[PDB]
Design a protein around this ligand. Structure first.
Ligand SMILES: *[C@@H](CC(=O)OCC)[C@H](C[C@@H]1CCNC1=O)NC(=O)[C@H](CC(C)C)NC(=O)[C@@H](NC(=O)OCc1ccccc1)[C@@H](C)OC(C)(C)C
Ligand SMILES: *[C@@H](CC(=O)OCC)[C@H](C[C@@H]1CCNC1=O)NC(=O)[C@H](CC(C)C)NC(=O)[C@@H](NC(=O)OCc1ccccc1)[C@@H](C)OC(C)(C)C
Lengths: 301, 301
């Protein structure tokens, strides 16, 4: 037992991480098969990458996997991502997919500098298409991922920080999450919201781990729950979020609307100085799947 | 910028993780060089391992690294750890040390089942020689580690859970942290304490990341700070903990006793519903070194 902020093992991703320099500008790339993927920002207020890209040649790109230099035999741009075709297929290429995720979904970040992995942590795509990361100068090209079965689902590539100390990036087809651009013109995320379905998933993790004080005798309708939830800046709970909470409901024998009723009381009356899984806030960066993986799914590894 | 619960990349450790079965009892082992290390519990209320061990032979031990079977050519016991000598030196053996850590120090856990890595999270050795982990049936032989430079410092091997949903384990010489034994006789951890020096390290991370509301004009002596801290179940701050807070003090230009003064006000007056780095509790599972690594040290990777 126990409940931690658990990331996926990073090894399969560490084997794909390389350094990409265009002239003397350096950041991280992802080396899968023939191709290295990195932010197009490497080739540079309001730049015209289309032209900067064509004005470049394959000798303007130095890619190193540790010691070894990868010979760049072509370069192409797709959205905000650069793709460099190289002589060599990465022999440590795992099984993988490029996946575009929805707000509320979680993933692991391997933070990289100079093409070398320095750390792992768990993130959520926030409702405002931001992530709350930890990224410094040189982190761009760091990727987010889930390990779906034997298979790395890459969902995020790091591009920038906004003034609130929050972070923005693309899918691996180089399309931004949310309304952001890879240029240093004033942009802002706008107000975030709490991920209702993830908080309920985490009250279910708390019960599974024997933290039960917050449970009550009451029930609620979906509309009476949302009427309270949206006052406290929580996303409305949708029938579909009730649906995917079904398996955690059956395991615990606590009906989703009864957990809603317990959540409603917590929001109106606070914690009374008590904690839930060693937290004084309701946590919203665990999904239903995250709870089932950590609390049991993990033993079949 | 940003501050997350950051683990070390797990790849170097994933390359050492193997499955160890003695007859039909299965758990995780650590494959470094000639040797696989695992809990002696694999060879089994109050067992006599010395005898159970001798009554065993090298064909009673099946070790698999993925597909490949490792031929066991000898077995030996050191404290609570089994060491199996094998035909083959692990070709993915990283540079490593066995290190015994002190309460307050943090490390990364690679949680393993069936010899396969399933997750990574960050832990602290608690003052009561417990860790707050996430471990199920089959997790034993999962290791804790720091990556000190190029070098994996292995500090923990998982052995058991106590009734409070907390966890106990050994160094890699198989000596327990704290007063615990690898037998299913009633043991208990006893009351824990808050790691004063880590909380101050994390108020320094908060300032570095521009979270500054809690700072005040006041100062305090060490004794007046401890007089308040120990009321709230915090370890007394020692001159030596003031010492290792020096580099974070100079970087932020906030004197350690001024941060102490700010901590004293937080403990006496609470948060007023405000948060610090998105937390409503003072966090004590970041050390001084952890703050410097995440906030800057990481870019030299
Ligand atoms: C990755 C770049 C890299 O590795 O390249 C080295 C060659 C970094 C990651 C940033 C660094 C700081 N923390 C991170 O996560 N990315 C960048 O530096 C971005 C470059 C591209 C956008 C070209 N720039 C920023 O992230 C920038 N944000 C920004 O300017 O955009 C919005 C904006 C808001 C107000 C005013 C103007 C623009 C950062 C560095 O700027 C701050 C002030 C928001 C921190
Ligand atoms: C690792 C064993 C493994 O993988 O072997 C498979 C062959 C597990 C890890 C535990 C499982 C549950 N969560 C964990 O972290 N280790 C064990 O099962 C321990 C075996 C050795 C001690 C022989 N047993 C326990 O952890 C046990 N604790 C315990 O009995 O010790 C103190 C005690 C307290 C009260 C009464 C008697 C003894 C757990 C399983 O028992 C509970 C009730 C404390 C959960």
């Amino acid at each position: 037992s126990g409940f931690r902020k658990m990331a996926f093992p990073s090894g399969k991703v560490e084997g794909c991480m390389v350094q990409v320099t265009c002239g003397t500008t350096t950041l991280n790339g992802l080396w899968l098969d023939d191709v290295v993927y990195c932010p197009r920002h490497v080739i540079c207020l309001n730049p015209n990458y289309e032209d900067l890209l064509i004005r470049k040649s394959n000798h303007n790109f130095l890619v190193q996997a540790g010691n070894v230099q990868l010979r760049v035999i072509g370069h192409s741009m797709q959205n905000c991502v650069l793709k460099l075709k190289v002589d060599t297929a990465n022999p440590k290429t795992p099984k993988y997919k490029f996946v575009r995720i929805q707000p509320g979904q979680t993933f692991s970040v391997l933070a990289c500098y100079n093409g070398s992995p320095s750390g792992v942590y768990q993130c959520a795509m926030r409702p405002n298409f931001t992530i709350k990361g930890s990224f410094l100068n040189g982190s761009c090209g760091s990727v987010g991922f889930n390990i779906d079965y034997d298979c790395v689902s890459f969902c995020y590539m790091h591009h920038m920080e906004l003034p609130t100390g929050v972070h923005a990036g693309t899918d691996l087809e180089g399309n931004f999450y949310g309304p952001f651009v890879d240029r240093q013109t004033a942009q802002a995320a706008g107000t975030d919201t709490t991920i209702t379905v993830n908080v309920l998933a985490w009250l279910y993790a708390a019960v599974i781990n024997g933290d039960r004080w917050f449970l009550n005798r009451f029930t609620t309708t979906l509309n009476d729950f949302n009427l309270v939830a949206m006052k406290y800046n929580y996303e409305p709970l949708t029938q579909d979020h009730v649906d995917i909470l079904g398996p955690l409901s059956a395991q615990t024998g606590i009906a989703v609307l009864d957990m809603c009723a317990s959540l409603k009381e917590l929001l109106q009356n606070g914690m009374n100085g008590r904690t839930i899984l060693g937290s004084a806030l309701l946590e919203d960066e665990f999904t239903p799947f995250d709870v089932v993986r950590q609390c049991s799914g993990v033993t079949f590894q």
